[PDB]
Every structure is written in C-alpha cells, then in structure tokens.
Amino acid sequence: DMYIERAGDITWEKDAEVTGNSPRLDVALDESGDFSLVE
Amino acid sequence: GETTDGVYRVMTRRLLGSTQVGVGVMQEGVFHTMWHVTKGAALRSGEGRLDPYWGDVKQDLVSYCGPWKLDAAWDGLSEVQLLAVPPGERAKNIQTLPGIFKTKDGDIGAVALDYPAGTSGSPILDKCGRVIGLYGNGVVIKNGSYVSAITQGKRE
Numbered sequence: 157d158m159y160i161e162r163a164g165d166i167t168w169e170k171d172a173e174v175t176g177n178s179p180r181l182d183v184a185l186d187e188s189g190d191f192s193l194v195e
Numbered sequence: 196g197e198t199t200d201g202v203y204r205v206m207t208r209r210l211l212g213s214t215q216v217g218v219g220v221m222q223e224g225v226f227h228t229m230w231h232v233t234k235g236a237a238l239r240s241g242e243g244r245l246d247p248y249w250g251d252v253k254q255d256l257v258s259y260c261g262p263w264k265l266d267a268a269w270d271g272l273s274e275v276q277l278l279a280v281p282p283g284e285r286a287k288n289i290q291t292l293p294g295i296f297k298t299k300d301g302d303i304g305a306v307a308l309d310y311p312a313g314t315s316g317s318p319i320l321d322k323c324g325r326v327i328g329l330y331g332n333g334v335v336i337k338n339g340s341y342v343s344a345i346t347q348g349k350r351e
C-alpha cells in the first residue's frame with residue numbers, strides 16, 4: 157500500500173551546486189519502456 | 196489528503212520499515228510520477244485515495260486524479276535543475292547542462308546525474324521553475340555512469 161508525503165516546493169535555486177556532463181548518445185526505446193545504447 | 200502543489204515522496208510499508216520507492220509532482224490537482232515507481236497501483240494521501248487516470252509503460256509515465264498537466268519543454272540550450280528527492284534525505288537542487296538521447300523518432304534531453312533508484316520521478320526544471328520532465332528512466336553508458344532521459348508527457 158503506497159502513500160505520498162510532501163517533500164517541498166518546486167522552485168529553481170539560485171547558486172545551486174552545478175555538476176554532470178552532457179553526453180550525446182544514440183539510443184533505442186523498446187515497447188517495455190527500456191532505453192538501450194545503439195552501437 | 197494533501198493536494199498542495201509540489202514534490203512528494205512515494206513510500207511503501209510492504210517491505211522492511213517504510214521504504215521510498217520514488218517521487219512525483221502534484222500540479223493542478225493531478226499527481227504525476229513514472230510508471231515503474233507505482234506499476235499503476237492506487238496511492239494513499241493521508242486518509243484520501245488517488246486513483247490512476249492515465250498511464251503508458253513505453254513512455255514510463257502515469258497520472259492520478261486527472262490527465263497529465265506538465266507541458267514545458269527543455270529549450271535545447273540552457274542548464275536545468277534536477278530537484279532530487281533522495282530516500283531519507285532533504286530535497287536538493289542540482290544544476291546541469293543536459294546531453295541528448297538521439298533516437299529514430301527524434302532527440303530527447305538527458306541528464307547525467309546518478310541518484311538512488313528511489314529518486315525516480317524527481318522533477319527536472321527550467322529557469323522559470325516549470326517542470327520539463329521527470330528523472331529516472333535511462334541508460335548506463337561505457338564509463339558505467341547513469342544518464343536519465345528528461346521524460347515529459349503530453350498535455351491533451
């Protein structure tokens with residue numbers, strides 16, 4: 157039995173921690189909603 | 196139950212203690228999350244019940260109480276923020292420049308941030324605070340790192 161609990165407002169934060177790269181990938185999406193890499 | 200707009204954890208007491216299985220967005224009286232978080236089951240909010248209204252396994256999305264309301268889109272150029280809600284931890288904003296998933300049916304923004312599975316359904320936002328999609332359906336690349344699509348639904 158699943159239940160929800162509020163965690164916060166949805167807002168943009170000024171000076172938030174900035175990280176992560178920006179990969180450009182060729183991908184495929186199957187009927188089950190799974191993404192896979194195309195090589 | 197609680198119907199105030201914002202981000203919410205999705206919990207279960209089926210396993211040991213209370214376990215966070217995902218996250219979602221309440222907007223315009225509709226609860227939005229990824230299908231793999233709830234598998235389309237009903238949800239509880241205090242003494243109230245939220246029933247599924249729309250869902251799609253291939254998109255990996257589900258809405259409760261009404262139709263999918265989120266329609267903002269990544270501009271393809273700017274940094275966005277993941278409003279990560281990790282299990283047992285406070286909501287935190289992480290800013291990043293999305294990459295791209297190139298598919299036979301078009302390009303989708305993608306964020307290269309790795310959080311616990313229970314963070315699935317956390318919203319990705321633009322500079323105006325609009326939700327441009329949900330985090331948690333993606334792929335593991337050569338480096339072994341996780342890259343999530345920015346998954347957005349259609350507002351009918």
Ligand SMILES: CC(=O)NCc1ncc[nH]1
Pocket residue numbers: 309310311312313314315330331332333334335341
């Ligand atoms: C293959 C896949 O989408 N993994 C699930 C996930 N891991 C962390 C967040 N979401």
